[PDB]
Design a protein around this ligand. Structure first.
Ligand code: CL
Ligand code: CL
Ligand code: CL
Ligand code: CL
Ligand code: CL
Ligand code: CL
Ligand code: ZN
Ligand code: ZN
Ligand code: ZN
Ligand code: ZN
Ligand code: ZN
Ligand code: ZN
Ligand code: ZN
Ligand code: ZN
Ligand code: ZN
Ligand code: ZN
Lengths: 102, 102
C-alpha cells in the first residue's frame, strides 16, 4: 500500500478499511495483529493468543498504529498460518461501475 | 438494501459507503441525487444540473438524508441515463478471503 493512504474506519468490529490511490483494503484486525506479534515473537501460538479478536471495537489511535505497522511488516500479505490478511478491491472497479473514469 | 443498515461515510468525496447484513454498497452521490430529483421533477436535465457533483464534501446529515431517500426510490438501481447508482460487494467475499465464515 502506498505511503499516502486514508483510513476509513472499522467494519463489523472485524476489518479496518484503508485505501491508497489504487485499492481499498479490508484488513483483518486479528490477522494483522497476529502477524505483527509473530514478526516480533517468532511464536505462532503466542502471537495468536495475545492478539485482538474479531468483534472487539478498536480506538482510532489503535487503528492508526496497526495500519502504520502493517506497511513495515516483512510479510504484510498473509498471517503465519497462510491466511490472507486483507481483501482488496481496485478502486477502478467501483468508479467504472458507475460510469466514471479512474 | 435492508432497512437495518450502517453508513460508513464518504469516499473520495464521490461515494457514500453503506452496508446491510448482505452487501457493502458504494453509492454515487451525484447519481443518487440525480435519481431523487428526477423522480420528483420528471426532468432529466434539470435533475442533473441541480444535483451535487463528485468532489463535494457532504455533511453527515445530508448523507443520512440521501441514503434514507435512496431506499424509497422507485428505481434505486440506475440513474435516468442508465448508469448504475452504486457498486456492491457481497460481504461474504471479504470475510471468505481472510478465512472467516459469513
Ligand atoms: Cl478472531
Ligand atoms: Cl497518531
Ligand atoms: Cl499511530
Ligand atoms: Cl459528478
Ligand atoms: Cl437524522
Ligand atoms: Cl435523515
Ligand atoms: Zn508457543
Ligand atoms: Zn490460534
Ligand atoms: Zn489466530
Ligand atoms: Zn499514533
Ligand atoms: Zn493466523
Ligand atoms: Zn429540462
Ligand atoms: Zn448532465
Ligand atoms: Zn448527471
Ligand atoms: Zn436527518
Ligand atoms: Zn445520469
Amino acid at each position: 500500500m502506498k505511503p499516502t493512504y486514508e483510513i476509513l474506519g472499522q467494519m463489523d468490529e472485524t476489518f479496518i478499511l484503508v485505501k491508497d490511490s489504487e485499492y481499498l483494503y479490508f484488513v483483518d484486525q486479528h490477522l494483522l495483529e497476529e502477524r505483527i506479534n509473530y514478526e516480533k515473537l517468532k511464536d505462532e501460538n503466542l502471537a495468536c493468543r495475545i492478539s485482538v479478536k474479531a468483534g472487539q471495537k478498536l480506538s482510532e489511535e489503535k487503528i492508526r498504529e496497526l495500519i502504520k505497522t502493517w506497511r513495515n511488516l516483512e510479510n504484510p500479505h498473509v498471517c503465519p498460518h497462510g491466511r490472507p490478511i486483507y481483501y482488496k478491491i481496485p478502486l477502478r472497479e467501483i468508479y467504472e461501475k458507475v460510469g466514471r473514469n479512474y
